[PDB]
């Protein structure tokens, strides 16, 4: 137990995910003995595997792993290069672990590239669940599934920071705290279109609030009914966003400021 390794967590159940960048390009057998080699201890791969061109396994001992991030630029293959070792601190070899793979980031990324445009700062993400290129490719960027949206809002501050018209229309997203940041990540964005998305309340826009818009949408989002007139759907919506001028494709009276 304690001191050396308590039978339970919070204490010393310390896991590690050691990743050999490009491991595939080497023999599982050769590659590993070559580590133990340049190594200083006896390390055992806790379920090694291939994530595309990825080489990775787990390590229980905190310091075992320690002597592995020590073996970097250490091995020199036949091609005469250096095999790498991305060593990290982690969770049990199988837990809640939701996330995704980096191959897909490049998936999601390429898909977006064709769905963008640098003359209208487009970002038509009509059906990120339904778009060829990935449709029938086992994967589906489920934006409402938190991280996906995260990793989606990721590519933007990275590639397209200036974007002006993002469009989630129809991606059945509901609670907005996921993308509750694009205000920072995607600064200008003078337009949006959270239409179709099963948004039940106006309590969402409270999350985009700071986003300085001028054009939005929202039909088919439960919240519609949660309203009577138009005078306030124009006052609730416009509340969260004053500079608002257009809306759901119609004539929004010249916003009269006091």
């Amino acid at each position: 137990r304690g001191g050396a390794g308590t039978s339970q967590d919070g204490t010393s159940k310390n896991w590690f995910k050691i990743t050999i960048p490009y491991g595939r390009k080497y023999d599982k057998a050769w590659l590993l003995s070559m580590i133990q080699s340049k190594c200083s201890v006896p390390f055992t791969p806790i379920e090694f595997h291939y994530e595309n061109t990825r080489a990775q396994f787990f390590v229980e001992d905190a310091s075992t792993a320690s002597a592995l991030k020590a073996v970097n630029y250490k091995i020199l293959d036949r091609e005469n290069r250096r095999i790498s070792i991305i060593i990290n601190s982690s969770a049990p070899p199988h837990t809640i672990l939701n996330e995704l793979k980096p191959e897909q980031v490049e998936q999601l990324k390429l898909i977006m590239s064709k769905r963008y445009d640098g003359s209208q700062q487009a970002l038509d993400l009509k059906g990120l669940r339904s778009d060829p290129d990935l449709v029938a490719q086992n994967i589906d960027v489920v934006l409402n599934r938190r991280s996906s949206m995260a990793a989606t809002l990721r590519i933007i501050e990275e590639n397209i920071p200036e974007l002006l018209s993002l469009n989630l229309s129809n991606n059945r997203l509901y609670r907005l705290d996921d993308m509750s940041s694009i205000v920072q990540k995607a600064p200008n964005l003078k337009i949006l279109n959270l239409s179709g998305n099963e948004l039940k309340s106006e309590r969402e826009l409270d999350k985009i609030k700071g986003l300085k818009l001028e054009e939005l949408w929202l039909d088919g989002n439960s919240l519609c009914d949660t309203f009577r007139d138009q005078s306030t759907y124009i006052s609730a919506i416009r509340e969260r966003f004053p500079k608002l001028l257009r809306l759901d494709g119609h004539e929004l009276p010249p916003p009269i400021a006091f």
Side-chain angles (χ1 to χ4, degrees), residues 205-222:
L205 296 295
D206 303 51
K207 315 276 53 284
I208 310 164
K209 192 177 75 184
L211 219 204
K212 309 178 189 180
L213 300 169
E214 274 172 43
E215 187 175 331
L216 168 57
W217 299 58
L218 262 150
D219 117 60
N221 298 192
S222 323

PDB file of all heavy atoms in Angstrom, residues 205-222:
ATOM      1  N   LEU A 205     -28.147  31.778 -25.833  1.00  0.00           N
ATOM      2  CA  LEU A 205     -27.509  32.993 -26.334  1.00  0.00           C
ATOM      3  C   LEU A 205     -26.760  33.704 -25.230  1.00  0.00           C
ATOM      4  O   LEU A 205     -25.916  34.557 -25.489  1.00  0.00           O
ATOM      5  CB  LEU A 205     -28.551  33.938 -26.928  1.00  0.00           C
ATOM      6  CG  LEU A 205     -29.278  33.410 -28.161  1.00  0.00           C
ATOM      7  CD1 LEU A 205     -28.268  33.249 -29.287  1.00  0.00           C
ATOM      8  CD2 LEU A 205     -29.971  32.074 -27.845  1.00  0.00           C
ATOM      9  N   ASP A 206     -27.085  33.347 -23.994  1.00  0.00           N
ATOM     10  CA  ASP A 206     -26.443  33.930 -22.827  1.00  0.00           C
ATOM     11  C   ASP A 206     -24.978  33.498 -22.841  1.00  0.00           C
ATOM     12  O   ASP A 206     -24.121  34.149 -22.237  1.00  0.00           O
ATOM     13  CB  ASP A 206     -27.114  33.415 -21.538  1.00  0.00           C
ATOM     14  CG  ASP A 206     -28.623  33.696 -21.486  1.00  0.00           C
ATOM     15  OD1 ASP A 206     -29.337  33.367 -22.461  1.00  0.00           O
ATOM     16  OD2 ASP A 206     -29.096  34.232 -20.457  1.00  0.00           O
ATOM     17  N   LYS A 207     -24.717  32.398 -23.551  1.00  0.00           N
ATOM     18  CA  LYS A 207     -23.391  31.784 -23.664  1.00  0.00           C
ATOM     19  C   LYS A 207     -22.549  32.321 -24.814  1.00  0.00           C
ATOM     20  O   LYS A 207     -21.325  32.272 -24.767  1.00  0.00           O
ATOM     21  CB  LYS A 207     -23.549  30.270 -23.816  1.00  0.00           C
ATOM     22  CG  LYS A 207     -24.569  29.637 -22.846  1.00  0.00           C
ATOM     23  CD  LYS A 207     -23.986  29.306 -21.464  1.00  0.00           C
ATOM     24  CE  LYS A 207     -23.287  30.499 -20.787  1.00  0.00           C
ATOM     25  NZ  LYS A 207     -21.938  30.761 -21.379  1.00  0.00           N
ATOM     26  N   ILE A 208     -23.214  32.819 -25.848  1.00  0.00           N
ATOM     27  CA  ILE A 208     -22.547  33.395 -27.015  1.00  0.00           C
ATOM     28  C   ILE A 208     -22.493  34.905 -26.796  1.00  0.00           C
ATOM     29  O   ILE A 208     -21.636  35.602 -27.342  1.00  0.00           O
ATOM     30  CB  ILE A 208     -23.354  33.144 -28.286  1.00  0.00           C
ATOM     31  CG1 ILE A 208     -23.719  31.663 -28.387  1.00  0.00           C
ATOM     32  CG2 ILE A 208     -22.570  33.632 -29.482  1.00  0.00           C
ATOM     33  CD1 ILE A 208     -24.825  31.377 -29.388  1.00  0.00           C
ATOM     34  N   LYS A 209     -23.454  35.369 -25.993  1.00  0.00           N
ATOM     35  CA  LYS A 209     -23.651  36.761 -25.597  1.00  0.00           C
ATOM     36  C   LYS A 209     -22.601  37.715 -26.139  1.00  0.00           C
ATOM     37  O   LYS A 209     -22.872  38.492 -27.062  1.00  0.00           O
ATOM     38  CB  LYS A 209     -23.698  36.856 -24.056  1.00  0.00           C
ATOM     39  CG  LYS A 209     -24.174  38.205 -23.482  1.00  0.00           C
ATOM     40  CD  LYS A 209     -24.266  38.209 -21.938  1.00  0.00           C
ATOM     41  CE  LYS A 209     -22.881  38.282 -21.256  1.00  0.00           C
ATOM     42  NZ  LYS A 209     -22.908  38.193 -19.748  1.00  0.00           N
ATOM     43  N   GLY A 210     -21.406  37.637 -25.555  1.00  0.00           N
ATOM     44  CA  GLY A 210     -20.298  38.496 -25.947  1.00  0.00           C
ATOM     45  C   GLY A 210     -19.972  38.555 -27.431  1.00  0.00           C
ATOM     46  O   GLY A 210     -19.348  39.525 -27.902  1.00  0.00           O
ATOM     47  N   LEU A 211     -20.378  37.520 -28.169  1.00  0.00           N
ATOM     48  CA  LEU A 211     -20.134  37.477 -29.605  1.00  0.00           C
ATOM     49  C   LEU A 211     -20.860  38.666 -30.254  1.00  0.00           C
ATOM     50  O   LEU A 211     -22.095  38.803 -30.152  1.00  0.00           O
ATOM     51  CB  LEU A 211     -20.644  36.162 -30.205  1.00  0.00           C
ATOM     52  CG  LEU A 211     -19.778  35.527 -31.303  1.00  0.00           C
ATOM     53  CD1 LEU A 211     -20.672  34.644 -32.160  1.00  0.00           C
ATOM     54  CD2 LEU A 211     -19.104  36.589 -32.173  1.00  0.00           C
ATOM     55  N   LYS A 212     -20.078  39.524 -30.910  1.00  0.00           N
ATOM     56  CA  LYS A 212     -20.596  40.719 -31.569  1.00  0.00           C
ATOM     57  C   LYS A 212     -21.128  40.411 -32.974  1.00  0.00           C
ATOM     58  O   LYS A 212     -20.414  40.544 -33.976  1.00  0.00           O
ATOM     59  CB  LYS A 212     -19.489  41.776 -31.615  1.00  0.00           C
ATOM     60  CG  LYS A 212     -18.835  42.017 -30.243  1.00  0.00           C
ATOM     61  CD  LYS A 212     -17.697  43.042 -30.315  1.00  0.00           C
ATOM     62  CE  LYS A 212     -16.919  43.113 -28.997  1.00  0.00           C
ATOM     63  NZ  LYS A 212     -15.810  44.117 -29.057  1.00  0.00           N
ATOM     64  N   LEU A 213     -22.395  40.002 -33.021  1.00  0.00           N
ATOM     65  CA  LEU A 213     -23.080  39.643 -34.258  1.00  0.00           C
ATOM     66  C   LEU A 213     -23.671  40.822 -34.993  1.00  0.00           C
ATOM     67  O   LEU A 213     -23.351  41.985 -34.728  1.00  0.00           O
ATOM     68  CB  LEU A 213     -24.212  38.651 -33.980  1.00  0.00           C
ATOM     69  CG  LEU A 213     -23.832  37.314 -33.344  1.00  0.00           C
ATOM     70  CD1 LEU A 213     -25.096  36.576 -32.903  1.00  0.00           C
ATOM     71  CD2 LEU A 213     -23.026  36.485 -34.342  1.00  0.00           C
ATOM     72  N   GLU A 214     -24.562  40.480 -35.915  1.00  0.00           N
ATOM     73  CA  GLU A 214     -25.256  41.431 -36.758  1.00  0.00           C
ATOM     74  C   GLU A 214     -26.289  40.639 -37.545  1.00  0.00           C
ATOM     75  O   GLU A 214     -27.239  41.212 -38.073  1.00  0.00           O
ATOM     76  CB  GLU A 214     -24.269  42.131 -37.710  1.00  0.00           C
ATOM     77  CG  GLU A 214     -23.568  43.375 -37.108  1.00  0.00           C
ATOM     78  CD  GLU A 214     -22.448  43.957 -37.991  1.00  0.00           C
ATOM     79  OE1 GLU A 214     -22.645  44.068 -39.228  1.00  0.00           O
ATOM     80  OE2 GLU A 214     -21.377  44.319 -37.436  1.00  0.00           O
ATOM     81  N   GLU A 215     -26.101  39.317 -37.616  1.00  0.00           N
ATOM     82  CA  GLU A 215     -27.029  38.418 -38.325  1.00  0.00           C
ATOM     83  C   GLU A 215     -27.070  37.010 -37.706  1.00  0.00           C
ATOM     84  O   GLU A 215     -26.042  36.343 -37.590  1.00  0.00           O
ATOM     85  CB  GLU A 215     -26.656  38.307 -39.810  1.00  0.00           C
ATOM     86  CG  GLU A 215     -27.684  37.528 -40.642  1.00  0.00           C
ATOM     87  CD  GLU A 215     -27.368  37.514 -42.143  1.00  0.00           C
ATOM     88  OE1 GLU A 215     -26.741  38.486 -42.645  1.00  0.00           O
ATOM     89  OE2 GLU A 215     -27.769  36.534 -42.822  1.00  0.00           O
ATOM     90  N   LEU A 216     -28.261  36.564 -37.316  1.00  0.00           N
ATOM     91  CA  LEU A 216     -28.431  35.250 -36.699  1.00  0.00           C
ATOM     92  C   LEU A 216     -29.698  34.592 -37.212  1.00  0.00           C
ATOM     93  O   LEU A 216     -30.455  35.199 -37.970  1.00  0.00           O
ATOM     94  CB  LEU A 216     -28.498  35.378 -35.170  1.00  0.00           C
ATOM     95  CG  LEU A 216     -28.940  34.179 -34.314  1.00  0.00           C
ATOM     96  CD1 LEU A 216     -28.051  32.965 -34.568  1.00  0.00           C
ATOM     97  CD2 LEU A 216     -28.888  34.576 -32.854  1.00  0.00           C
ATOM     98  N   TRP A 217     -29.907  33.343 -36.803  1.00  0.00           N
ATOM     99  CA  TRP A 217     -31.061  32.534 -37.201  1.00  0.00           C
ATOM    100  C   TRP A 217     -31.435  31.694 -35.970  1.00  0.00           C
ATOM    101  O   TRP A 217     -30.862  31.928 -34.909  1.00  0.00           O
ATOM    102  CB  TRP A 217     -30.661  31.655 -38.401  1.00  0.00           C
ATOM    103  CG  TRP A 217     -30.233  32.469 -39.632  1.00  0.00           C
ATOM    104  CD1 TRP A 217     -29.215  33.401 -39.709  1.00  0.00           C
ATOM    105  CD2 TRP A 217     -30.872  32.483 -40.909  1.00  0.00           C
ATOM    106  NE1 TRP A 217     -29.200  33.996 -40.944  1.00  0.00           N
ATOM    107  CE2 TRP A 217     -30.202  33.453 -41.705  1.00  0.00           C
ATOM    108  CE3 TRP A 217     -31.951  31.773 -41.463  1.00  0.00           C
ATOM    109  CZ2 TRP A 217     -30.579  33.733 -43.027  1.00  0.00           C
ATOM    110  CZ3 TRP A 217     -32.330  32.045 -42.778  1.00  0.00           C
ATOM    111  CH2 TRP A 217     -31.641  33.021 -43.548  1.00  0.00           C
ATOM    112  N   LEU A 218     -32.374  30.747 -36.082  1.00  0.00           N
ATOM    113  CA  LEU A 218     -32.761  29.934 -34.919  1.00  0.00           C
ATOM    114  C   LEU A 218     -34.021  29.072 -35.044  1.00  0.00           C
ATOM    115  O   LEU A 218     -34.323  28.311 -34.126  1.00  0.00           O
ATOM    116  CB  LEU A 218     -32.932  30.826 -33.676  1.00  0.00           C
ATOM    117  CG  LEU A 218     -31.830  30.995 -32.616  1.00  0.00           C
ATOM    118  CD1 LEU A 218     -31.947  32.366 -31.990  1.00  0.00           C
ATOM    119  CD2 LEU A 218     -31.933  29.915 -31.551  1.00  0.00           C
ATOM    120  N   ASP A 219     -34.760  29.188 -36.146  1.00  0.00           N
ATOM    121  CA  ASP A 219     -35.997  28.401 -36.333  1.00  0.00           C
ATOM    122  C   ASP A 219     -35.888  26.938 -35.877  1.00  0.00           C
ATOM    123  O   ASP A 219     -34.789  26.381 -35.770  1.00  0.00           O
ATOM    124  CB  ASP A 219     -36.440  28.435 -37.817  1.00  0.00           C
ATOM    125  CG  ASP A 219     -36.433  27.025 -38.498  1.00  0.00           C
ATOM    126  OD1 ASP A 219     -37.158  26.107 -38.029  1.00  0.00           O
ATOM    127  OD2 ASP A 219     -35.707  26.837 -39.516  1.00  0.00           O
ATOM    128  N   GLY A 220     -37.035  26.318 -35.613  1.00  0.00           N
ATOM    129  CA  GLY A 220     -37.035  24.920 -35.210  1.00  0.00           C
ATOM    130  C   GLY A 220     -36.331  24.572 -33.904  1.00  0.00           C
ATOM    131  O   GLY A 220     -36.092  23.384 -33.599  1.00  0.00           O
ATOM    132  N   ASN A 221     -35.982  25.602 -33.134  1.00  0.00           N
ATOM    133  CA  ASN A 221     -35.332  25.401 -31.846  1.00  0.00           C
ATOM    134  C   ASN A 221     -36.399  25.629 -30.770  1.00  0.00           C
ATOM    135  O   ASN A 221     -36.718  26.774 -30.450  1.00  0.00           O
ATOM    136  CB  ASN A 221     -34.165  26.386 -31.658  1.00  0.00           C
ATOM    137  CG  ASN A 221     -33.068  26.210 -32.703  1.00  0.00           C
ATOM    138  OD1 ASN A 221     -31.976  26.752 -32.567  1.00  0.00           O
ATOM    139  ND2 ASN A 221     -33.363  25.458 -33.752  1.00  0.00           N
ATOM    140  N   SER A 222     -36.959  24.525 -30.260  1.00  0.00           N
ATOM    141  CA  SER A 222     -37.992  24.501 -29.211  1.00  0.00           C
ATOM    142  C   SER A 222     -38.392  25.878 -28.678  1.00  0.00           C
ATOM    143  O   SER A 222     -39.571  26.246 -28.696  1.00  0.00           O
ATOM    144  CB  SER A 222     -37.505  23.645 -28.034  1.00  0.00           C
ATOM    145  OG  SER A 222     -36.758  22.524 -28.479  1.00  0.00           O
TER     146      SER A 222
END
